[PDB]
Write a protein that binds this ligand. Structure first.
Ligand SMILES: [Cu+2]
Ligand SMILES: [Cu+2]
Ligand SMILES: [Cu+2]
Length: 224
């Protein structure tokens, strides 16, 4: 339909096919999104066993169409306007003093479900660094995701730096560079500069034996 697709609660499917250094892994997440209040509630399983990288490094890669855009900002919501046909979301992520992730995702409706299917490639990580050495805390900070229009590509770009808490009290920074392109050829909303304000909780399911991550997230657009 349109932004009409997000007036209620929407089921979500997320699938990540990952290769970091020499390691293969697969993640599938399921749950629900409520864009009217900007809320995600999701559970992710590593189907391939224990992950070679920390769960928090995957959070940004694992549906910004569920951001809450306040009424006065609805003209600037690229993500919903591309639906149902969806958009391609690509990122290049530089972990400071540490390797890089390259991601490509398609985010679109498949029936009544919003699906995010991702390919992730990671290279040049240090064996004893914060990522391959699993030295990141199981939690997640608040960020501002700065969004700009990319009118030459009929889409948007985003810039932000993720701050991962490290177990010794230091911070591991991850510079994100993001490009989104609509899949369909219908017109989309090309926004004035603004940002998304994020908050996230990472937790566990006591009955789940598999390596997993429960996620609760709230995101609201601001800056206009
Ligand atoms: Cu209708
Ligand atoms: Cu292999
Ligand atoms: Cu593989």
């Amino acid at each position: 339909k349109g932004e009409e697709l997000f007036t209620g609660v929407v089921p979500i499917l997320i699938e990540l096919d990952g290769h970091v250094n020499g390691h293969h892994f697969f993640v599938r997440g399921e749950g629900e999104g409520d864009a009217t209040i900007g809320k995600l509630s999701l559970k992710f399983i590593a189907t391939t066993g224990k992950l070679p990288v920390p769960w928090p490094t995957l959070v940004t890669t694992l549906v910004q169409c569920f951001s809450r855009y306040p009424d006065h900002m609805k003209r600037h919501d690229f993500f919903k306007s591309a639906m149902p046909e969806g958009y391609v979301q690509e990122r290049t992520i530089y972990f400071k003093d540490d390797g890089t992730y390259k991601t490509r995702a398609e985010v679109k409706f498949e029936g009544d479900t919003l699906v995010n299917r991702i390919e992730l490639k990671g290279i040049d990580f240090k064996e004893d660094g914060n990522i391959l050495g699993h030295k990141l805390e199981y939690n997640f900070n608040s960020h501002k995701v700065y969004i700009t229009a990319d009118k030459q590509n009929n889409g948007i770009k985003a810039n932000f730096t993720i701050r991962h808490n490290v177990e010794d009290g230091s911070v591991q920074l991850a510079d994100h560079y993001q490009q989104n392109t609509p899949i369909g050829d219908g017109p989309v909303d090309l926004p004035d500069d603004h940002y998304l304000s994020t908050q996230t909780i990472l937790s566990k399911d006591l009955n789940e034996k598999r390596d997993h991550m429960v996620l609760l997230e709230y995101v609201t657009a601001a800056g206009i």
